[PDB]
Amino acid sequence: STGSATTTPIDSLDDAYITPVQIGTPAQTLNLDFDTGSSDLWVFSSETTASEVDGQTIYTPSKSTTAKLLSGATWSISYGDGSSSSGDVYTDTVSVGGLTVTGQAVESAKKVSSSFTEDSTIDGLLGLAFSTLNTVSPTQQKTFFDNAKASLDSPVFTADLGYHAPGTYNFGFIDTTAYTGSITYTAVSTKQGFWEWTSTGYAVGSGTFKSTSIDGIADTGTTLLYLPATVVSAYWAQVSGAKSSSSVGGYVFPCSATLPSFTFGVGSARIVIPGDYIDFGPISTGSSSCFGGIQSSAGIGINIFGDVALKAAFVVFNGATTPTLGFASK
Numbered sequence: 001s002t003g004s005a006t007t008t009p010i011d012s013l014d015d016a017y018i019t020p021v022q023i024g025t026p027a028q029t030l031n032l033d034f035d036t037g038s039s040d041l042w043v044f045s046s047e048t049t050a051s052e053v054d055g056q057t058i059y060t061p062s063k064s065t066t067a068k069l070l071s072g073a074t075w076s077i078s079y080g081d082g083s084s085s086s087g088d089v090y091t092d093t094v095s096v097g098g099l100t101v102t103g104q105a106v107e108s109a110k111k112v113s114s115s116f117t118e119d120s121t122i123d124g125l126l127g128l129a130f131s132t133l134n135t136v137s138p139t140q141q142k143t144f145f146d147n148a149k150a151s152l153d154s155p156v157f158t159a160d161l162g163y164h165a166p167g168t169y170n171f172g173f174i175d176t177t178a179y180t181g182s183i184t185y186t187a188v189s190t191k192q193g194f195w196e197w198t199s200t201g202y203a204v205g206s207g208t209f210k211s212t213s214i215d216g217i218a219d220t221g222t223t224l225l226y227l228p229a230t231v232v233s234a235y236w237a238q239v240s241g242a243k244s245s246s247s248v249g250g251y252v253f254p255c256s257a258t259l260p261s262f263t264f265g266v267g268s269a270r271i272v273i274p275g276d277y278i279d280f281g282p283i284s285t286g287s288s289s290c291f292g293g294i295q296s297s298a299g300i301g302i303n304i305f306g307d308v309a310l311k312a313a314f315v316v317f318n319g320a321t322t323p324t325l326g327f328a329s330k
């Protein structure tokens, strides 16, 4: 079996993407952030503290005839940005894009932190990293991807995210019309539970490619591209009005600059981010300074290939017994 679903950026900056998911019988459709950096599917629900819900769509397990309480299990998760949520667990039927799994754990939020309540467009998260990072206790639960692989035509999903435009998640097949030239695959380490891999180097604009290993994770759930401090300084040293601003938290530049491209290596292949993708947008509406899409990961302690890098590629998450990651230009 396969499935295919459109994913849309939540705002005109592409700060994140949502994809509809149908939970329950009869279906309730919730718009989830698919996050290849964590492994929990949780949603806002009829159990979540009322005062912690600003316009999101909730799941009500008591209206689903296939939901069942997973007795004794609870979960609690915090993310790299500080935000957090906990709750208890039902299993229910969940379909994306046509592809149905029965018996998928749907973590029901009793509490969510203030970042979640304040964003009305995301009704919860569907995790697609490996199932070792799931927070359910005492027995961890598998992601939707792992429960699906028995039935999928092939054990893969692709992410094809758009720049200020919608894109696709596909499960189970690779669409050969979505990309140009051929996919290059590079090895995944799962030792810390992420789609973690090693890029072979970088180049800024039309200058030289420097071969240097940058170990990073492919994370659909992080908006920006976070790289080591000295690669990031080498890129903004080509943009004449760019500086590091302590006030705003990163490199900012004049919104009028044409930014150069940034190339990253995948084995012997090279993926080119166009400089307009790196112009994140202005620091405030009207302002003449904009915030850059490439920042230093020194503060996070791992390099993150997030949606600024990923949406310049068609990306295959190969979840065979030895996983790999595949990238093609598009």
Ligand SMILES: CC[C@H](C)CNC(=O)[C@H](CC(C)C)C[C@H](O)[C@H](CC1CCCCC1)NC(=O)[C@H](Cc1c[nH]c[nH+]1)NC(=O)C(Cc1cccc2ccccc12)Cc1cccc2ccccc12
Binding pocket: 015, 016, 033, 035, 036, 037, 038, 039, 077, 078, 079, 080, 081, 082, 083, 115, 116, 119, 125, 133, 135, 217, 219, 220, 221, 222, 223, 224, 300, 302, 304
């Ligand atoms: C079991 C624990 C595991 C480790 C869970 N995984 C992680 O925490 C991962 C860390 C891993 C890369 C090491 C990160 C994970 O993918 C997680 C998924 C998010 C969670 C919040 C909701 C949206 C999805 N991503 C993140 O935690 C990254 C982390 C980060 C660190 N520094 C900068 N960013 N956060 C994000 O990228 C934010 C957006 C964001 C955060 C911080 C600075 C930003 C600067 C400019 C633009 C965006 C920034 C996610 C986000 C996007 C859009 C709307 C949002 C509304 C509310 C809350 C978050 C929103």
